[PDB]
Coordinates of C-alpha atoms and ligand atoms in Angstrom, one line a residue:
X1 CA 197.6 -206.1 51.4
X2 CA 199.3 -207.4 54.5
X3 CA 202.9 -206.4 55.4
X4 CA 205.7 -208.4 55.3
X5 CA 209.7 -208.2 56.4
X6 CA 211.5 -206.4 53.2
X7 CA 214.7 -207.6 53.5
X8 CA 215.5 -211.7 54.0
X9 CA 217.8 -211.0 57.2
X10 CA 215.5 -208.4 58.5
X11 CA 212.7 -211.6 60.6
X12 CA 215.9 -212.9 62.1
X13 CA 217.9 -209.2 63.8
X14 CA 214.5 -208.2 64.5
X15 CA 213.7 -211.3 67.1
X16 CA 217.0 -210.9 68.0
X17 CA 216.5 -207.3 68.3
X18 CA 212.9 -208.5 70.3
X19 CA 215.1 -210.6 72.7
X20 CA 217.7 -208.7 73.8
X21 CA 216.9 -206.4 76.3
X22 CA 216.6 -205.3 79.5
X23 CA 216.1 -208.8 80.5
X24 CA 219.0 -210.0 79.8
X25 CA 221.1 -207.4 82.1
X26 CA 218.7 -205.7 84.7
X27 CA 216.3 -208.4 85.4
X28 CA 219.0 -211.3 85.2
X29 CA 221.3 -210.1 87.5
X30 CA 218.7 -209.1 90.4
X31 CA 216.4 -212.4 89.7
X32 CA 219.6 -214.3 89.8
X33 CA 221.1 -212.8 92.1
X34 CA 218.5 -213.7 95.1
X35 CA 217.7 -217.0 93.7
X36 CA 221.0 -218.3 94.5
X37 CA 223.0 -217.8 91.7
X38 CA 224.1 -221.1 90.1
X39 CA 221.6 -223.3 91.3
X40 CA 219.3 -220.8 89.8
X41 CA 221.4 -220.8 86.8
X42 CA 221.2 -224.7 85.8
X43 CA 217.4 -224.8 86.7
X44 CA 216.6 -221.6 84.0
X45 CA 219.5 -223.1 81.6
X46 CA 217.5 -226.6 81.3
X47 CA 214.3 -224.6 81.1
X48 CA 215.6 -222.8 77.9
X49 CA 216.5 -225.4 75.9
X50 CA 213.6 -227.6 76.9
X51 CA 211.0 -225.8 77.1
X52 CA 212.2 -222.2 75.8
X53 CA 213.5 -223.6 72.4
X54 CA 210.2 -225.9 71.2
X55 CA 208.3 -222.1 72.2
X56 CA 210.1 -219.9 70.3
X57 CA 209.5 -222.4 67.1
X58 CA 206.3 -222.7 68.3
X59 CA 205.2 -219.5 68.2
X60 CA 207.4 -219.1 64.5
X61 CA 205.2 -221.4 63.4
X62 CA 201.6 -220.0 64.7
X63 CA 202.4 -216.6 63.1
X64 CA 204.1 -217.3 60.1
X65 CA 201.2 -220.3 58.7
X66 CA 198.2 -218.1 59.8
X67 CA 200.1 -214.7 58.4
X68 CA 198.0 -212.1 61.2
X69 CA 198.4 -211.0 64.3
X70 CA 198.3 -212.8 68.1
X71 CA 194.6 -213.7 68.7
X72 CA 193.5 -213.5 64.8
X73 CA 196.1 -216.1 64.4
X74 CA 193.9 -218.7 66.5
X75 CA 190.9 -217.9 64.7
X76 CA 192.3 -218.6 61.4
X77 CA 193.9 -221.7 62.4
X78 CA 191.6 -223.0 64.6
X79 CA 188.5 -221.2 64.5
X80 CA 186.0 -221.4 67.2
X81 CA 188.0 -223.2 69.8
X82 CA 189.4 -222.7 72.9
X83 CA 192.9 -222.0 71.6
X84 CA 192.9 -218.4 71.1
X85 CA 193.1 -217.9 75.0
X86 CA 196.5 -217.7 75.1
X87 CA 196.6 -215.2 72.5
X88 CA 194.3 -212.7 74.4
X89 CA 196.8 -213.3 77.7
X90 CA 199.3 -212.4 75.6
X91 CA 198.4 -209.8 74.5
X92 CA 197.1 -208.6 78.3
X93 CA 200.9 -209.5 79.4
X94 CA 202.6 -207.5 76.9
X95 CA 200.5 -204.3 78.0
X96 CA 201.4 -205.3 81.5
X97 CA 205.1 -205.8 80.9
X98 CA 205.4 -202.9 78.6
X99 CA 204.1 -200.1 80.9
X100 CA 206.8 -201.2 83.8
X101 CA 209.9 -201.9 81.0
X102 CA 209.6 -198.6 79.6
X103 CA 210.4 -197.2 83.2
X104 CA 213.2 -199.1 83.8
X105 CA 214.1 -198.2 80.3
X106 CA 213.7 -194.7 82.2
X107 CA 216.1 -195.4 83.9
X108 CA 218.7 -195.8 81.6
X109 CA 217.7 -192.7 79.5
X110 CA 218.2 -190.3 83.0
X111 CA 222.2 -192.0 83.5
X112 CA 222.7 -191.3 80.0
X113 CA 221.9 -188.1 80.3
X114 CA 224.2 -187.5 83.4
X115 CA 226.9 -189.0 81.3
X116 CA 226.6 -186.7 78.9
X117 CA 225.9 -183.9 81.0
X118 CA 229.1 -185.0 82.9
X119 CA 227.1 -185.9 86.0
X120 CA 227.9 -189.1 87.3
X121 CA 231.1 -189.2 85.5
X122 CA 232.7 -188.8 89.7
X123 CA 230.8 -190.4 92.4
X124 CA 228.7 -187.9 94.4
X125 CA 228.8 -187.2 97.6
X126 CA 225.3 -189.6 98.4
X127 CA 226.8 -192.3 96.9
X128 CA 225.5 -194.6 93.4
X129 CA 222.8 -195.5 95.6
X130 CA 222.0 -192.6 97.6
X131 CA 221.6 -191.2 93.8
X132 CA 219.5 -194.0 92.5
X133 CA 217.4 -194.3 95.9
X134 CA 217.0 -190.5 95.3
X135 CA 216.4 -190.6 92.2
X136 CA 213.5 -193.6 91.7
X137 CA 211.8 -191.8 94.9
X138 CA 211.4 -188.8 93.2
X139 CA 208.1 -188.8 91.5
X140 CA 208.1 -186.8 88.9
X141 CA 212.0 -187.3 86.9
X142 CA 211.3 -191.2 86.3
X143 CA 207.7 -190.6 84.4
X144 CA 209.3 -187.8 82.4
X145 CA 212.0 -190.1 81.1
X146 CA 209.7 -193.2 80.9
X147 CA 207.8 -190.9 78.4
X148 CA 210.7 -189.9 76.3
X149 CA 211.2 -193.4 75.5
X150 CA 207.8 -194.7 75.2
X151 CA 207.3 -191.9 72.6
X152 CA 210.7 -193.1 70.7
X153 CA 208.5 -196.4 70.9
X154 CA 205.8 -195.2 69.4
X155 CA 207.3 -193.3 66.7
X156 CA 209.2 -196.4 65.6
X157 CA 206.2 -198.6 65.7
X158 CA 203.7 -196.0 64.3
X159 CA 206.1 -195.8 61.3
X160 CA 205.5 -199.0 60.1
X161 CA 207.3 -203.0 59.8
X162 CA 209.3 -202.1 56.8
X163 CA 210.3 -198.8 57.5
X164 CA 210.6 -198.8 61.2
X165 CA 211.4 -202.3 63.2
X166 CA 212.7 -203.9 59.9
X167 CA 215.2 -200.5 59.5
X168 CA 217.2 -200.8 62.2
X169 CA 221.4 -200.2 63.5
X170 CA 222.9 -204.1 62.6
X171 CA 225.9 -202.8 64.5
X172 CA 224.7 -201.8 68.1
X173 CA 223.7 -205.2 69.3
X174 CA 227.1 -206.5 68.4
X175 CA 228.6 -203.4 70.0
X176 CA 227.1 -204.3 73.0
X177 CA 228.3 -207.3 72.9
X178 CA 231.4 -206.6 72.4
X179 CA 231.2 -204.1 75.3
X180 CA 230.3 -206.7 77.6
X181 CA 232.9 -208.9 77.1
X182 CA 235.6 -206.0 77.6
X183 CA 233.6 -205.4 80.7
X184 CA 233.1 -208.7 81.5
X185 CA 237.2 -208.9 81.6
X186 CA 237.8 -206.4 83.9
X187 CA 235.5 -207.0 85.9
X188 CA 237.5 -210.5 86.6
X189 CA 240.7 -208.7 87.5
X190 CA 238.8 -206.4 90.4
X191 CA 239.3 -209.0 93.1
X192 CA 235.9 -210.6 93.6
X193 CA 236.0 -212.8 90.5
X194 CA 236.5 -216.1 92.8
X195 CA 233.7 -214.8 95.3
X196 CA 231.3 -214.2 92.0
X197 CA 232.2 -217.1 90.1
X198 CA 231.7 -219.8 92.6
X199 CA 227.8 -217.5 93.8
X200 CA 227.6 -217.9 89.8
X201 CA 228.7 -221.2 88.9
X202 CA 229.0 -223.7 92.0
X203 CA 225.9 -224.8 92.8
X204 CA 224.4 -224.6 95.9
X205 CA 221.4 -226.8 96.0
X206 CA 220.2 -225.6 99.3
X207 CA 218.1 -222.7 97.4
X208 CA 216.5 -225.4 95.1
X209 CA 214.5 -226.8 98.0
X210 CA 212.0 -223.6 97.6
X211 CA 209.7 -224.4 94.8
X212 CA 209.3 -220.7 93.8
X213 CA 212.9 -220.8 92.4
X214 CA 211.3 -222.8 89.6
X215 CA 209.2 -220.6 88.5
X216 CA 211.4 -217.5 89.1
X217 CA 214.0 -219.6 86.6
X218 CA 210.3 -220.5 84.6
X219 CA 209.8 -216.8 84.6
X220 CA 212.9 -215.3 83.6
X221 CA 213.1 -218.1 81.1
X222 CA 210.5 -216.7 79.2
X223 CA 210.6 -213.2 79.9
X224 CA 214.1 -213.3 78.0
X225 CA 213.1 -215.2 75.0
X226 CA 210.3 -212.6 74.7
X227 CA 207.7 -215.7 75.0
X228 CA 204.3 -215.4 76.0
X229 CA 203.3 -211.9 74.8
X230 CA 202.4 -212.4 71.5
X231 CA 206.0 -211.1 70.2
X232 CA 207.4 -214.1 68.2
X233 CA 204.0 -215.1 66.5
X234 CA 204.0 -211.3 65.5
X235 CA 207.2 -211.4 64.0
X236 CA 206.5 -214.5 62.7
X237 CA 203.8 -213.1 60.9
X238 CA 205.5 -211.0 59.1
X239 CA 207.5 -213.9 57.5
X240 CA 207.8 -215.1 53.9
X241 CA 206.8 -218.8 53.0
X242 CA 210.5 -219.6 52.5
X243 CA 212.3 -219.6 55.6
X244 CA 214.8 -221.4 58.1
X245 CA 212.5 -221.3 61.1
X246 CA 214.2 -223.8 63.5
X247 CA 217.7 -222.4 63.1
X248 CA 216.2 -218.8 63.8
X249 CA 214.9 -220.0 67.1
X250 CA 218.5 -221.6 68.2
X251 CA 219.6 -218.7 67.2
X252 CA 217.7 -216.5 69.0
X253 CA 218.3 -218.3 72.2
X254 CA 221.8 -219.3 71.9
X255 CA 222.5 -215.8 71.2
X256 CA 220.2 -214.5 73.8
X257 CA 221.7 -217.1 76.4
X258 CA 225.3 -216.1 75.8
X259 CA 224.0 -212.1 76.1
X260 CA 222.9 -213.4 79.3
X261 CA 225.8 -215.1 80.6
X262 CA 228.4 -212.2 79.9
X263 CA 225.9 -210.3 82.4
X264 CA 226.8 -212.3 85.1
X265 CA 230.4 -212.2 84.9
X266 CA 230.2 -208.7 84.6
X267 CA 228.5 -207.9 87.5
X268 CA 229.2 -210.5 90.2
X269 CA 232.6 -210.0 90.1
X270 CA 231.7 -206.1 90.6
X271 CA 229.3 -206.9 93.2
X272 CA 231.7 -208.7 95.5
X273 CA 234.6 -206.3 94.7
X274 CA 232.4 -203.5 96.2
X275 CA 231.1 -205.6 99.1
X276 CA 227.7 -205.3 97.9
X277 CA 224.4 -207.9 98.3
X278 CA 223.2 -210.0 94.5
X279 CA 220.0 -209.9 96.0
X280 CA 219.6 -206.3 96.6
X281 CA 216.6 -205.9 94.0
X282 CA 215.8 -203.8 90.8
X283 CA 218.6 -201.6 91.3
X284 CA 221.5 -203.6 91.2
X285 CA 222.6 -203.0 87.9
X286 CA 221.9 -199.1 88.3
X287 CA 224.2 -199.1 92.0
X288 CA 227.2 -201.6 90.8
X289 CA 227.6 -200.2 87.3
X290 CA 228.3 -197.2 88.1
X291 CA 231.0 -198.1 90.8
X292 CA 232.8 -200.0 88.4
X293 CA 232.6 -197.4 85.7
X294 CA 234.0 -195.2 88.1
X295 CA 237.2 -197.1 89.0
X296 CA 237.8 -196.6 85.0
X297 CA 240.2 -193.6 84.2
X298 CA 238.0 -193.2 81.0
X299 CA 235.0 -195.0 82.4
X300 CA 232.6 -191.5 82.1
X301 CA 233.4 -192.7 78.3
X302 CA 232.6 -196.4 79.2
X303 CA 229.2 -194.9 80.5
X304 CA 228.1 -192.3 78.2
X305 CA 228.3 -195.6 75.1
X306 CA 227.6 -198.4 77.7
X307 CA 224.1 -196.8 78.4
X308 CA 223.5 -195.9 74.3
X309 CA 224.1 -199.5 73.3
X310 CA 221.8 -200.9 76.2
X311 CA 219.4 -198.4 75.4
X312 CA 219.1 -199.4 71.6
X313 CA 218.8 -202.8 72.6
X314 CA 215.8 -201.8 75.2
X315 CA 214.2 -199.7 72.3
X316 CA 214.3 -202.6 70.4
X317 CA 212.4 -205.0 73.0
X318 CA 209.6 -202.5 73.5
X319 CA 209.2 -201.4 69.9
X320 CA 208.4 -205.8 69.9
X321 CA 206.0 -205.1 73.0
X322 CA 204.0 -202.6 71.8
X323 CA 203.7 -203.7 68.2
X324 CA 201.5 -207.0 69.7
X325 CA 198.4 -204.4 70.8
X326 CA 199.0 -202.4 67.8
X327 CA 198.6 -205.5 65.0
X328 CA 195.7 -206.2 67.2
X329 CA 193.6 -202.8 67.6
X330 CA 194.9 -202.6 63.6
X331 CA 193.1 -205.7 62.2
X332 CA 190.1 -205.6 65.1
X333 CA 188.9 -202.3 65.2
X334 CA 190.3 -200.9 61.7
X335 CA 192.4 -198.0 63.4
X336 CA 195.5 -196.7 61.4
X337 CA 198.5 -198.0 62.4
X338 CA 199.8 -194.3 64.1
X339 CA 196.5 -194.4 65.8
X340 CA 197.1 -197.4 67.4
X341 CA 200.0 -196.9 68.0
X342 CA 200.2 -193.5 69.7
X343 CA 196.8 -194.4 71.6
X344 CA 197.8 -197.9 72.8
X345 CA 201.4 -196.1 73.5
X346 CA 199.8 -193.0 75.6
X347 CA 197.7 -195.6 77.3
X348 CA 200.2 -197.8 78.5
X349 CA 202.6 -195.0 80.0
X350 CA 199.8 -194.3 82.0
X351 CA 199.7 -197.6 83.4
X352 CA 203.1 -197.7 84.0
X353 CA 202.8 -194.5 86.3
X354 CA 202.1 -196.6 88.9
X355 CA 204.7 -199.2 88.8
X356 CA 207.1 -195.9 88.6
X357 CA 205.3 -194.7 92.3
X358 CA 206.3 -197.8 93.7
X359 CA 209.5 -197.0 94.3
X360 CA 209.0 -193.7 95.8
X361 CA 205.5 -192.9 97.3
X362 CA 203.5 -195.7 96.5
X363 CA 206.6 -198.1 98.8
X364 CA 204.5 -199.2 101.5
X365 CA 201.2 -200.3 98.5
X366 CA 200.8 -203.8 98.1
X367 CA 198.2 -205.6 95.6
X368 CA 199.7 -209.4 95.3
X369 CA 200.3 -209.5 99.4
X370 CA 203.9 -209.0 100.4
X371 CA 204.3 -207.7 96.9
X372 CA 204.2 -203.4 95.7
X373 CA 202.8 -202.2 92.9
X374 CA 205.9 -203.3 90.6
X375 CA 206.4 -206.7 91.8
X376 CA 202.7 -207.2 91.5
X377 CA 202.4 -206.0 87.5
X378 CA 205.8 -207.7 87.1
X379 CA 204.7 -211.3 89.2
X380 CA 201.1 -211.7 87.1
X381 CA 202.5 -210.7 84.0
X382 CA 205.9 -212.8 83.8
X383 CA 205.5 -215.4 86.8
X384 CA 201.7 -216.2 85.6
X385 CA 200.7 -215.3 82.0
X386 CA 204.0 -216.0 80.2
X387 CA 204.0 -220.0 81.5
X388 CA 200.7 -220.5 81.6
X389 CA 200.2 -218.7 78.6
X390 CA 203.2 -220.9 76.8
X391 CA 201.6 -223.9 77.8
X392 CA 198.5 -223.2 75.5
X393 CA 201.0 -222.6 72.8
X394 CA 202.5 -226.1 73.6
X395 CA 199.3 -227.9 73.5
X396 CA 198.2 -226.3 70.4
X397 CA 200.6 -227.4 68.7
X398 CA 200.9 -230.8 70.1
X399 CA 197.3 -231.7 70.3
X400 CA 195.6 -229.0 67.9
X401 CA 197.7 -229.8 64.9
X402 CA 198.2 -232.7 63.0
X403 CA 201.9 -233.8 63.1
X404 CA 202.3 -233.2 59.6
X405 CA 201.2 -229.7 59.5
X406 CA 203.3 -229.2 62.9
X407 CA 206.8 -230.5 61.2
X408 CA 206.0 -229.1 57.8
X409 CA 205.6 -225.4 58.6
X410 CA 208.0 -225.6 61.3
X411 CA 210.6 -227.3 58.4
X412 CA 211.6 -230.3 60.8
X413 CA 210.0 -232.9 58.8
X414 CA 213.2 -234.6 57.5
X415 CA 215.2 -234.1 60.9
X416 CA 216.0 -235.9 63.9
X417 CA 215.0 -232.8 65.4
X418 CA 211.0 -232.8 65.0
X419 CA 210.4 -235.8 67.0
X420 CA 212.3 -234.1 69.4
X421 CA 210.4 -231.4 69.3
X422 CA 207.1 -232.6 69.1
X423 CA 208.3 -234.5 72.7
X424 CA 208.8 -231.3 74.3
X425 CA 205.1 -229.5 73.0
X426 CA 203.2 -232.7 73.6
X427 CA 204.7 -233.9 77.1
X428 CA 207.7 -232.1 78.1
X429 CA 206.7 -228.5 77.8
X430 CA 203.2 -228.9 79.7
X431 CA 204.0 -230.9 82.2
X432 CA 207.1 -229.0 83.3
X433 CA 205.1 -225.5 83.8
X434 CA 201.8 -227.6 85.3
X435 CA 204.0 -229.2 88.3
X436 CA 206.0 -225.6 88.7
X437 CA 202.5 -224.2 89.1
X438 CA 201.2 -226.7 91.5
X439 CA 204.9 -226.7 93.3
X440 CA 204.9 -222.7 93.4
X441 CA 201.5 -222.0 94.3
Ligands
LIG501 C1 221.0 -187.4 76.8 C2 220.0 -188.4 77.5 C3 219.6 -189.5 76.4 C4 219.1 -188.8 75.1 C5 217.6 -188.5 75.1 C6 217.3 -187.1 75.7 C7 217.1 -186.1 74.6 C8 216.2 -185.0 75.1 C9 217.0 -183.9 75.9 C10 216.1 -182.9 76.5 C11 215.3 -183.6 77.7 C12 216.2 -183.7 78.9 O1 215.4 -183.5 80.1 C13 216.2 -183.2 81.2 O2 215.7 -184.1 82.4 C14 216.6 -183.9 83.5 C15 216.4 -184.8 84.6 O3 217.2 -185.9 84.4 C16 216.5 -182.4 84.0 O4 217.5 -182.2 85.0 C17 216.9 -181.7 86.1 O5 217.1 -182.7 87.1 C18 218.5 -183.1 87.1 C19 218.8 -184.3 88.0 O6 219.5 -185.2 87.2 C20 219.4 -181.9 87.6 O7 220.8 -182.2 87.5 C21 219.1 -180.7 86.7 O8 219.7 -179.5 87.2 C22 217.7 -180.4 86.5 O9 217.5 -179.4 85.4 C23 216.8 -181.5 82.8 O10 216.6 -180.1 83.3 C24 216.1 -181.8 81.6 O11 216.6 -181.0 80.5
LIG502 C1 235.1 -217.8 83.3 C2 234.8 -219.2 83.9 C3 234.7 -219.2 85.4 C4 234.4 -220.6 86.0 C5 234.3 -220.6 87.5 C6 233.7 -222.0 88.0 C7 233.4 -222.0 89.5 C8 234.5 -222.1 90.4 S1 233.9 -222.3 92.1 C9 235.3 -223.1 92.9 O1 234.9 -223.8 94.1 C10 235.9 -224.6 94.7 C11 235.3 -225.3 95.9 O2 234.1 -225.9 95.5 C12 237.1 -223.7 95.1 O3 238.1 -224.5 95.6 C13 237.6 -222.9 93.9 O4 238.6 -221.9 94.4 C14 236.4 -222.1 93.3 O5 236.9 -221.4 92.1
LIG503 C1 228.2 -222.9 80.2 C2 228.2 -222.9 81.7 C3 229.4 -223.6 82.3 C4 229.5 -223.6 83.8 C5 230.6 -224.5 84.4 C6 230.7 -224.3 85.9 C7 231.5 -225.4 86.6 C8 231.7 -225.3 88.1 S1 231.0 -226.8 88.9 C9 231.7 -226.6 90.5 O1 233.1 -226.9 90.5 C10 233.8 -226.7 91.8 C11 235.2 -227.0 91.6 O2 235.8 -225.9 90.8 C12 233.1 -227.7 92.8 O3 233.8 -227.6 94.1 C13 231.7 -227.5 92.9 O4 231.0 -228.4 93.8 C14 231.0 -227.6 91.5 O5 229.6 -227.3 91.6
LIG504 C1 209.5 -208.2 77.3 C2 210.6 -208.6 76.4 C3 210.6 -207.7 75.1 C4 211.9 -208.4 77.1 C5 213.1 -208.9 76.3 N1 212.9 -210.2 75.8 C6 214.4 -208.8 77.1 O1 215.0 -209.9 77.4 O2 214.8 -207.7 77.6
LIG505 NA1 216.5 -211.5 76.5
LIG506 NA1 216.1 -205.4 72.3

C-alpha cells in the first residue's frame, strides 16, 4: 500500500514547488554575481538545457518505473550492481544541503518578522548590512529561526504526500512571480539598469579562463533543478503510470530558468544603484533588498509579502529535501513516517548549527582549505555530489537500460526528442561533468 499523488496536477506544482527556491534568488545572485555575471550566465544556461533537462527526465523516469524511494529505486531496477551509488550520495547531499538551506531559510523568517513588527520598515542607524552583519554573528537568533522553519518542514512532511506536499497554495508561486517582475521593473528605472544589464548580459570572457566557473555554473545548475539529491526520483515515485513526463521536465526548468532570470534583473540593477559589489557573498540579497524596499513609499508593504511568498516557495524546496531521508528511513528501517520525519528533521538542524556559527564565531574555521564551515557543507554537497552524483544517473540510463525501456517509460519513443535525449545521457551529459571535474580540480 504505497502512496501516490491524489490529484493529476498535484506531481507537476509539487516539482515545481521542489525547484523553486532559495536557489533561484539567494544563491543565483551571489554565485552569479562573482562569477562574472554573463559569461557565467551563458555557461549555466547551456548547462541546463544540455545536461539539466535529460536529468530531470532522468530521474522522472528512475522513480516513477521502480515506484520507491532514492536507493530502493536501484535495487529494484538493477539489483546488485553498482548503480545505486548515486542514490546513497543523494541522499548524503540532501542532508547536507538541507541543514544549511533551512538557515538561510532563517533568514528570511527573522526579516519577516521585522516587517511585521515594523522593524526594518526605515533603515537603521547601522545600516542593512550593519543589521545583517549583526545579525548572522549573533549566535543564538539565526538557530532559533532555522528551527521554526525546520519544524514547519517537518510538520508538512510528517503529515503525509497526499495531505501535506500534494495540499499546497497554487497561488503563491505565481504571486511571486508576479512580484518579481513588478520588482524587476523598478528596479530598471533606479539608475543602474545599464551598469547591471551589461555585468548581466554582455559577456566578458575574461572570467571563463578559470575552470572553476564551470563547475560553479555545473553547480548552481543543478542545485536549482533540485538534481542530485534524490528529490525528482522521489517525486517521481509518487507518479501514476499515465503521465506526460518529458513536458513536466521542460516545464520544470523553463519555468525555473525564467524564476531565475527575473532575479537578476531585479537585483543588479539595485546593486549598482546603491554602489554596491555582485560579489559580496551570501548576503547580497539580504543587504540590497532591503535598500530597495526602502526607497518604496509603501515598500515596508513590499517587504512584509515579498518575504511570505519567498518563504512559501523555500518551505516548499525543503519540505522536497527532507522527504528524500524520510522515504528512505520509512521503507529501510520500518519507522512511521512522523518518526522519520521529526528524527531525521531534529537531526539535521543540528547539523546545520554549524553552518549557522560560520558566520559569526566559527568565521575564522575552515574544513575544505580557504573555505568556512558553510562553504565547505555547501562546496561537497552541491560542487561535488550533485555532478558526480548526476553523472551515475546519466550512465544508468544510458548504459544500464535498454533503449526501449529508456524511451518507453520516459514517453519519447515516437519523438524526435529521445534520440536526442539518449545523446545527452550516453555522451553529452558524462563527458561534460568528467572534463569540469578534471578542469576544476
Ligand atoms: C512573523 C515572522 C514570520 C512568522 C513565523 C513566526 C511565528 C512565531 C512568532 C513567535 C516567535 C518569534 O520569536 C521572536 O524572535 C525575535 C528575534 O528575531 C525576538 O526578538 C528579539 O530580538 C529582536 C531582534 O530582531 C529584538 O528586536 C527584540 O526586542 C527581541 O525580543 C522576539 O522576542 C521573539 O518573539
Ligand atoms: C531587459 C533586457 C536587457 C538587455 C540588456 C543587454 C546588454 C546590453 S550591454 C551594452 O553594451 C554596449 C557595449 O558593448 C553598450 O554600448 C550599451 O550601452 C550596453 O547596453
Ligand atoms: C534569454 C537571454 C537573452 C540575453 C541577450 C543578451 C544580449 C547582449 S549581447 C552584447 O551586446 C552588446 C551590444 O548591446 C555587445 O557590445 C556585447 O559585446 C554583447 O555581448
Ligand atoms: C535544494 C533544492 C531543494 C533547492 C531548490 N531547487 C532551489 O532552487 O531553491
Ligand atoms: Na530553483
Ligand atoms: Na520551493
Amino acid at each position: 500500500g504505497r502512496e501516490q499523488w491524489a490529484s493529476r496536477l498535484g506531481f507537476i506544482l509539487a516539482a515545481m514547488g521542489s525547484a523553486v527556491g532559495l536557489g533561484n534568488i539567494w544563491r543565483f545572485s551571489y554565485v552569479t554575481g562573482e562569477n562574472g555575471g554573463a559569461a557565467f550566465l551563458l555557461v549555466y544556461l547551456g548547462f541546463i538545457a544540455l545536461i539539466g533537462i535529460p536529468i530531470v527526465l532522468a530521474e522522472f523516469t528512475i522513480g516513477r518505473r521502480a515506484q520507491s524511494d532514492a536507493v530502493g529505486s536501484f535495487e529494484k531496477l538493477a539489483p546488485g550492481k553498482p548503480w545505486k551509488v548515486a542514490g546513497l550520495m543523494g541522499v548524503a547531499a540532501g542532508f547536507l544541503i538541507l541543514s544549511f538551506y533551512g538557515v538561510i531559510a532563517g533568514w528570511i523568517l527573522f526579516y519577516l518578522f521585522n516587517y511585521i513588527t515594523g522593524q526594518l520598515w526605515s533603515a537603521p542607524a547601522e545600516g542593512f548590512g550593519g543589521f545583517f552583519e549583526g545579525f548572522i554573528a549573533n549566535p543564538t537568533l539565526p538557530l532559533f529561526w532555522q528551527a521554526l522553519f525546520m519544524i514547519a518542514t517537518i510538520w508538512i512532511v510528517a503529515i503525509g504526500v497526499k495531505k501535506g506536499i500534494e495540499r499546497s497554495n497554487k497561488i503563491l508561486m505565481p504571486l511571486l512571480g508576479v512580484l518579481l517582475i513588478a520588482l524587476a521593473i523598478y528596479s530598471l528605472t533606479l539608475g543602474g539598469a545599464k551598469e547591471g544589464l551589461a555585468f548581466l548580459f554582455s559577456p566578458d570572457w575574461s572570467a571563463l579562463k578559470d575552470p572553476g566557473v564551470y563547475l560553479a555554473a555545473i553547480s548552481q545548475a543543478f542545485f536549482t533543478l533540485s538534481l542530485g539529491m534524490g528529490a525528482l526520483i522521489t517525486y517521481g515515485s509518487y507518479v501514476s503510470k499515465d503521465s506526460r513526463l518529458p513536458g513536466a521536465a521542460v516545464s520544470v526548468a523553463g519555468l525555473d530558468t525564467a524564476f531565475a532570470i527575473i532575479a537578476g534583473i531585479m537585483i543588479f540593477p539595485a546593486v549598482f544603484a546603491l554602489g554596491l559589489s555582485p560579489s559580496g557573498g551570501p548576503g547580497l540579497v539580504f543587504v540590497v533588498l532591503p535598500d530597495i524596499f526602502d526607497s518604496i513609499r509603501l515598500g515596508p508593504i513590499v517587504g512584509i509579502a515579498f518575504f511570505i511568498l519567498l518563504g512559501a516557495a523555500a518551505l516548499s524546496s525543503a519540505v522536497s529535501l527532507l522527504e528524500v531521508p524520510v522515504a528512505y528511513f520509512m521503507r529501510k528501517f520500518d519507522w512511521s513516517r512522523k518518526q522519520a520525519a521529526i528524527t531525521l528533521g531534529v537531526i539535521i538542524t543540528l547539523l546545520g548549527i554549524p553552518s549557522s556559527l560560520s558566520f559569526g564565531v566559527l568565521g575564522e574555521v575552515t574544513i575544505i582549505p580557504g573555505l568556512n564551515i558553510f562553504d565547505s557543507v555547501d562546496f561537497i554537497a552541491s560542487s561535488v555530489f550533485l555532478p558526480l552524483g548526476g553523472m551515475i544517473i546519466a550512465l544508468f540510463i544510458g548504459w544500464g537500460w535498454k533503449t526501449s525501456d529508456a524511451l518507453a517509460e520516459s514517453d519519447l519513443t515516437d519523438s524526435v526528442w529521445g534520440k536526442l535525449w539518449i545523446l545527452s545521457l550516453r555522451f553529452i551529459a558524462p563527458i561534460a561533468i568528467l572534463i569540469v571535474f578534471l578542469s576544476a580540480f
